[PDB]
Amino acid sequence: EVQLQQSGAELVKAGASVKLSCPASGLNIKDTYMHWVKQRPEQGLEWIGRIDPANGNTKFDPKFQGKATITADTSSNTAYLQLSSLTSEDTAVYYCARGVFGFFDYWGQGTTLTVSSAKTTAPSVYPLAPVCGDTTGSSVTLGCLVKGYFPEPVTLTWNSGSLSSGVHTFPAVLQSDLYTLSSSVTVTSSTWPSQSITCNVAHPASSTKVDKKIVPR
Amino acid sequence: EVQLQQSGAELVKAGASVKLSCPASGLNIKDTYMHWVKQRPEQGLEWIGRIDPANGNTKFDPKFQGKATITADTSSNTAYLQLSSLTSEDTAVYYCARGVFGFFDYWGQGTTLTVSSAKTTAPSVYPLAPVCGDTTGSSVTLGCLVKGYFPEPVTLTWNSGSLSSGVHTFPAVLQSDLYTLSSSVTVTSSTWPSQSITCNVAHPASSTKVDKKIVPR
Amino acid sequence: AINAPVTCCYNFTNRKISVQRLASYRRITSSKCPKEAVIFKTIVAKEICADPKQKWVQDSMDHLDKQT
Amino acid sequence: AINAPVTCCYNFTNRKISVQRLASYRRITSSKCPKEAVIFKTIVAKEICADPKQKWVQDSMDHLDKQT
Amino acid sequence: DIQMTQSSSSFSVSLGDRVTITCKATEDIYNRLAWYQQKPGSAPRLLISGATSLETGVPSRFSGSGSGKDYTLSITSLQTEDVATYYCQQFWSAPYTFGGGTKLEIKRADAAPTVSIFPPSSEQLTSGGASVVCFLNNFYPKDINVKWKIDGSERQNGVLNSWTDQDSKDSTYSMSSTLTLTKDEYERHNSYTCEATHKTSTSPIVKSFNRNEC
Amino acid sequence: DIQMTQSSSSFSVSLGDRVTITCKATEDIYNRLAWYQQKPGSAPRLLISGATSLETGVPSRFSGSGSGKDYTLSITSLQTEDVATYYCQQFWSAPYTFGGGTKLEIKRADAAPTVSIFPPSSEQLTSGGASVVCFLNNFYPKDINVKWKIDGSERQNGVLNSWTDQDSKDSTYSMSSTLTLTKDEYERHNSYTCEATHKTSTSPIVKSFNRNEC
């Protein structure tokens, strides 16, 4: 059936330009209109423009004129979205979709675009253990502070994954061009520090894997 | 689109058996019913039987049981019609057609089956010219008697084809295992025998071509 | 005439249908379709694609045809 | 539901249609079809397949939609 | 089995008028009838199925109707390409069966045949055979009868006949009659006559030649 | 441009009941409205177009209606897989525009957050940084406020927060608050407190630790 593939992820410096691609399979983009849609957590979904791969004509939401350039290739059955002189206001998720009528019945999984100047940086993993006054309840809570890495993602598990209940891994946040993330796990007092509790942080982009044993004090 | 090809022509001795084939293209015979139909000038159209290429089941008109065997091959997308211990009563034109419902929307051009014991025989071409008492009218008529050949067909033309008006080429007839055919052409008295009139008989099966000039007396 | 739409069947119901549920049927034979099919119209105007070769499908057709 | 028939368009009329001849239209988008299309219903119930991209086809849609 | 029959096997018609072909089933067939068209050198073509359903590529001037056991095909403003044979076929129950067919021919004024007779060629005599050929060309209507007479007696053995379909141009018909006999038999007699009987004359047309003289 | 707005951006609902989402257009759009569903990690999915047309692979419990400028999506016997965000979109005229979206959340009993505070690890101090982390786990409803206090003063700089979506299992929510400051600043003070304000109590929950002692 119809299926659209998208670049997936992109890291570009502020002021630079980027070209996102969306290859289609299962249909011929000549027979339709290919659209691009921007999405930000805060301001939601925004239609950018469309292109008729048959004649190369485009239609834009004035708000994106001179910042967005939509182009296509009927041979490779691919649609393109060019963004110029990027700014932080441009970082978001970009979807391309099909829709001769105006609504969109087929979407690409989307490509995340982060406008940064950061470089691929390994993460720093810090253990999170209770203090002296903290060690009385029935269940104890340990954590992990993964800080200073770029770009995303950094998967994370506890005891190689055999410790899944009571695990809370919070979404990453940009802290002055570097991501910070945390994860907490809750076990019962009896099992810690008797049993060993370790967090395993992986950061594919830097080919790093780090294990940090949570030790008291 | 849907198109069925058929063997075209077949010459088999009386008492022998034959297997006609009908290759399909444009559709998959698995999805339907493949039928065979017999047609004779005298007794018309006759449905023989059908086969479900999916399971190999057949249905016959009792009148053909033990004389007709329908089989198919989903891989080659071909249907077959086997006829056993042939008799002159079997010589006719055989069509194969598609039709899950019972009527036939797609046919093969058909395969002519002639039950004979004759062998490929070159034709004998005889000229047909008027007598003495015959040579008075405004337009004269000359002819050609093509006799003793086998099998069909024997195309025929006059003056290499530049003499087409007033030409009557009659259908072939079986005369004791050998075909006989004739053609007549009518021209004006002035043009004959002044102008040269010749008939050109071709018999592909024997790789023969014969030209016979029509001369008076 | 040539630019009329063509209705086709891309699936065949795998569950038989009660004749007391049928109202009419159509024969689909366009070479434009993946294959010949039968479209049943239920008492409530619902359309259902069925296999022309299944005994019940043929028995239904015979019934709807012999019907009024 | 899954075994319903799908109507598709295998041709597009190459001759524009007068709006005074139109009664309604359908949007064809099934991936089962060769491509997205519009089916016009004429005053006399005739169905005609048209290209979604042609100006007159869109102008017609806008009209039939803004109609009653 | 169900037997299908058609009113007539032939109709003489005019370009432009309405033509109706009738089919009658041996028993009710619940609109499970199909109509076919067939021309001299090819397979039949489906025009209508379900008694009313018109095949896509078929001209709208063709239509069919009826019920129970009686059906009819109708062609309005007949075109020349429409001249052919039409068959009805039932698909209610096997064995499937067709009607005997109805052939359409174009009507035209009467026309007497042009008769020409030919003695055996020398080439053929050299091989022991003796064939007398006779052409009866461009006559209408299609019915015609040829009789052979040797010295005055009617002969029936050794005669082979062939007919042509209606001419797309003048709408007439033609025939060829061949009398074939051993060279010895041929030389045993003298007068060879060819006699055509046709609507165009009360008296038959006669062409003949004497073997002796030239 | 046409502006689309939805009644609310959020609804707390129960599995099994009927849910209605409303859309209002800035001007008549003649049934040229579409509805989409979107879950946290993927593109929006078309459910309905033409205001009434249901996409094939879409469950029959979803339906839409309305006219002119007012439309509504309706979900009967809500399923857990149905919990997501719904957007309305207009395609009457470009620029095409969507509604701000309506997020569905599952309702459950109140639950106070479980608060845990953590001092900077030794590893981090070695690099000059000092991060105090605080987890507020499994609380409901989702609204919550965290405040940081150093020795008793409220601080707002250097704090980074993160929240999790509703837990597919217990339906609660969680939060992480991090106070980050130079190792020198960190050692410059003593008491570090984390304060949670939540529906579950008039008085905020407080967790704290003194830098000097263990």
Short mmCIF file of C-alpha atoms in Angstrom, two decimals, chain B residues 1-2 26 28-33 52-54 98-101 103 105-106, chain C residues 25-32 34-38 51-54 58 61:
data_model
loop_
_atom_site.label_atom_id
_atom_site.label_comp_id
_atom_site.label_asym_id
_atom_site.label_seq_id
_atom_site.Cartn_x
_atom_site.Cartn_y
_atom_site.Cartn_z
CA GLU B 1 -6.14 -6.21 -21.47
CA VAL B 2 -7.40 -9.80 -21.55
CA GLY B 26 -3.96 -10.20 -19.15
CA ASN B 28 -5.13 -15.31 -14.25
CA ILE B 29 -7.12 -18.38 -15.18
CA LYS B 30 -7.14 -19.36 -11.50
CA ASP B 31 -9.69 -16.65 -10.82
CA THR B 32 -12.14 -17.99 -13.38
CA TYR B 33 -13.70 -20.81 -15.42
CA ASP B 52 -11.67 -24.41 -12.65
CA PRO B 53 -7.89 -23.96 -12.91
CA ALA B 54 -7.88 -23.38 -9.15
CA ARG B 98 -13.43 -17.20 -20.03
CA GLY B 99 -16.63 -16.99 -17.99
CA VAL B 100 -17.14 -17.59 -14.28
CA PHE B 101 -20.86 -16.93 -14.73
CA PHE B 103 -21.58 -16.59 -20.64
CA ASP B 105 -16.92 -12.25 -22.49
CA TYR B 106 -13.43 -13.18 -23.75
CA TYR C 25 -26.82 -9.15 -6.60
CA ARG C 26 -24.59 -7.72 -9.32
CA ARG C 27 -22.14 -9.49 -11.60
CA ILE C 28 -18.70 -7.88 -11.75
CA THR C 29 -16.71 -8.82 -14.86
CA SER C 30 -14.72 -5.75 -15.95
CA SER C 31 -11.20 -6.66 -17.05
CA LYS C 32 -10.33 -3.49 -15.15
CA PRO C 34 -8.59 -7.91 -10.30
CA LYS C 35 -11.11 -10.70 -11.02
CA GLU C 36 -14.75 -11.56 -11.66
CA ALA C 37 -16.90 -11.21 -8.55
CA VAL C 38 -20.45 -11.04 -7.18
CA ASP C 51 -16.52 -15.49 -4.69
CA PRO C 52 -18.44 -16.57 -7.84
CA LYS C 53 -17.15 -20.12 -7.40
CA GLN C 54 -18.48 -20.98 -3.94
CA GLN C 58 -24.17 -19.69 -6.73
CA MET C 61 -27.76 -16.17 -7.18
#
